Design a protein around this ligand. Structure first.
Ligand code: UDP
Ligand code: MG
Ligand code: MG
Length: 238
């Protein structure tokens, strides 16, 4: 496949079907979809199940259980790394169990990277609808090329060439950072590693959507966005 879509899933039974469906109906259909379920409850697994009949889906379920295991690593980062090691696509993109892809998302992102060989990481705009009908609508824009993506660009808004993962692993020893000190902002930490070598190029269109309507006590102290943004400003790549 041209594209490997890596989705992480953990106990969001009321949302995961809409997420998975949004990927499976894309107008660009030449992808493999990894569904990396982190040993979810029965209800979640029962919602996911019918989608496994789609021949593009690559379903992997962890054996993880209990607070020690759930807090030893940033779990979604661990599952993404496992899927990266199995991916066959030239382009890599990420999805979650409560985020929806707009219908031409893969088409538009594949076209941008196909047309601009000099761009290695692209990002689109994203929209979040707050429900209470809609009480509020937020948009995270994609207006400029940026060497400082952490906490400005979401997990679900990017696509990058597979070759980006090589540089990152060479410097840092892994792709995403499994350290549990980056549990809350794992996407920012991976973008932080990418920003050591590449800027993020914008695609100014809203191509992903979010709807908002003992574990915590065992994680270590969470590192924050300001720390990541200040280290990239100090690194001065742009
Ligand atoms: O034990 C867990 C908890 C969460 N996640 C996944 O990590 C991703 C990001 O997490 P979450 O949605 O909880 O965070 P937020 O949207 O608040 O950044 C999602 O795809 C979850 O399915 C996971 O694999 N294992
Ligand atoms: Mg969420
Ligand atoms: Mg987040």
């Amino acid at each position: 496949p041209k594209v490997s879509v890596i989705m992480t899933s953990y106990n969001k039974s009321d949302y995961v079907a809409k997420s998975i469906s949004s990927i499976l109906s894309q107008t660009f259909s030449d992808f493999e979809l990894f569904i990396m379920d982190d040993n979810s409850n029965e209800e979640t697994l029962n919602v996911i199940r019918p989608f496994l009949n789609d021949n593009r889906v690559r379903f992997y379920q962890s054996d993880i259980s209990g607070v020690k295991e759930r807090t030893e690593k940033t779990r979604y980062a661990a599952l993404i790394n496992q899927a990266i090691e199995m991916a066959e696509g030239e382009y890599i993109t990420y999805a979650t169990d409560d985020n929806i892809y707009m219908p031409d998302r893969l088409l538009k992102m594949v076209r941008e990277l196909d047309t601009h060989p000099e761009k290695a990481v692209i990002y689109s705009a994203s929209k979040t609808y707050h429900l209470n009908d809609i009480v509020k609508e937020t948009v995270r824009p994609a207006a400029q090329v940026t060497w400082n993506a952490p906490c400005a660009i979401d997990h679900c808004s990017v696509m990058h060439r597979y070759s980006v993962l090589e540089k990152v692993k060479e410097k840092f020893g892994s792709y995403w950072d499994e350290s549990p000190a980056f549990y809350r902002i794992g996407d920012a930490r991976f973008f932080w590693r990418v920003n050591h070598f590449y800027p993020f190029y914008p695609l100014d269109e809203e191509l992903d959507l979010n709807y908002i309507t003992e574990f915590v006590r065992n994680l270590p102290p969470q590192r924050n966005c300001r720390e990541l943004r200040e280290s990239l400003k100090k690194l001065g790549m742009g």
